[PDB]
């Protein structure tokens, strides 16, 4: 029931991309696990599974670059993708698959039963850079006020933003990032709250940029002047 991907968000060209899928809620020894990736706006691409059948290289690009293994002692399935290029930038999904030969003429049965959330991997030589975080103060509206946090000039994706350590979820809207000509990303998260609460409620945005081990807690408050 759980397929948790982990691994680096950034890898340099010519290096090996190593991801891990930690499974839970079923017997790993008795289920196929496969890696599927998707580049933005492109077709899903099969990488490999824990159970290979036949004997052919049905993909010149992935010809002998993929290794998938199972570590039953850790309930983990690994992916190794060697000699990466920028073309290997994509979201990588851990999946649970059904693989059968049904037959008499052999017909091949393969479908994904469950999908992980996916892990974004950027292939680039650029160094990681943590964001600068700035408060977006609520101004002077139907009884509600909008406050937010600007998460400026980071690389690579992704960034996560929570409010009040996860206690505040209603009215939160985190916007997809813009990509600037500098190659750095910026995004904003806004929370809509009752105007009356501004004098009795503290609002803190929790920004986490894993690739740079950057964690910032920024208090957002009305400003006077």
């Amino acid at each position: 029931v759980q397929l948790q991907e982990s691994g680096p968000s950034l890898v340099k060209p010519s290096q090996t991309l190593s991801l891990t899928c930690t499974t839970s809620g079923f017997s790993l020894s008795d289920k196929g696990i496969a890696w599927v990736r998707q580049a933005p706006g492109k077709a899903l691409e099969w990488l490999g599974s824990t159970d290979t059948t036949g004997s052919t290289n049905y993909n010149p690009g992935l010809k002998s670059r993929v290794i998938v293994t199972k570590d039953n002692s850790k309930s983990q399935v690994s992916l190794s993708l060697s000699s990466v290029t920028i073309a290997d930038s994509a979201t990588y999904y851990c999946t649970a698959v059904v693989q059968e030969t049904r037959k008499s003429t052999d017909r091949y049965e393969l479908h994904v039963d469950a999908w992980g959330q996916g892990l974004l991997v950027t292939v680039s030589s650029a160094s990681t850079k943590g964001p600068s975080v700035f408060p977006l103060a609520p101004s002077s509206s139907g009884g509600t006020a909008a406050l937010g946090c600007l998460v400026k000039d980071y690389f690579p994706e992704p960034v996560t933003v929570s409010w009040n350590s996860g206690a505040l979820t209603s009215g939160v809207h985190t916007f997809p990032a813009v990509l600037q000509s500098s190659g750095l990303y910026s995004l904003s998260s806004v929370v809509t709250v009752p105007s009356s609460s501004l004098g009795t409620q503290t609002y803190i945005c929790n920004v986490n940029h894993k690739p740079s081990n950057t964690k910032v807690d920024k208090k957002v408050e009305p400003k006077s002047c």
Partner: protein, 216 residues
């Protein structure tokens, strides 16, 4: 990588029926056991159909699959707003350990009400200005259809330099969001009486204005 052939886009109106095709050779689609997946932005892909015609657990009956030779079809009846998504087919090829996916078909559901964008505009923070930088942040939400154009004004004059605007993206309520950032020097920011972010949607322009005299 081999790819199965799908139309780039399909459309159907609310309450009506739409068909999405998946075409391949006798060695993939022609072997049967085509599967279908629904990709909604921000969510994990969802399996809808496997084995040509079998519905995955949790999938209502108005999602149905069929196959005629080397073309398989996903049919969605009683279309609703939440059906807007990208739909991908798949099948094994030559072995049960090798899958080929389609290129994906984006479904637009017609007949939905137009929704005008809501705009929130933030001036540069005092912290950023202290860092000798200035960013105006224009946040645009709750619009449908998913296309806007953004224009920035300094007082009443157009600003072209320093503007970066995102593509529109689906929210969780079937509407779209976007953001636009104007980068200025602190000197430029303070040298004007106001800046405006003007968002045009389906021929109607909504705006917000900020001024350097406001507290931030």
């Amino acid at each position: 990588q081999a790819v199965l052939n799908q139309p780039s886009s399909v459309s159907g109106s609310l309450g009506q029926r739409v068909s999405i095709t998946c075409s391949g050779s006798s060695s993939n689609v022609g072997n049967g056991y085509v599967s279908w997946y629904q990709l909604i932005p921000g969510s994990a892909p969802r399996t809808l159909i496997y084995g040509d015609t079998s519905r995955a657990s949790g999938v209502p009956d108005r999602f149905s699959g069929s196959r005629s030779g080397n073309t398989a079809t996903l049919t969605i009846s009683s279309l609703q707003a939440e059906d807007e998504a990208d739909y991908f087919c798949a099948s094994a090829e030559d072995s049960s350990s090798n899958a080929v996916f389609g290129s994906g078909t984006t479904l637009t559901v017609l007949g939905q009400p137009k929704a005008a964008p809501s705009v929130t505009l933030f001036p540069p923070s005092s912290e950023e200005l202290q860092a000798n930088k200035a960013t105006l942040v224009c946040l645009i939400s709750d619009f449908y259809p998913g296309a806007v154009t953004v224009a920035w004004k300094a007082d009443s004059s157009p600003v072209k330099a320093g503007v970066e605007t995102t593509t529109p993206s689906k929210q969780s309520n079937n509407k779209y969001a976007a953001s636009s950032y104007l980068s200025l020097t602190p000197e430029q920011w303070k040298s004007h009486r106001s800046y405006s972010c003007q968002v045009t949607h389906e021929g109607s322009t909504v705006e917000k204005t900020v001024a350097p005299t406001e507290c931030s």
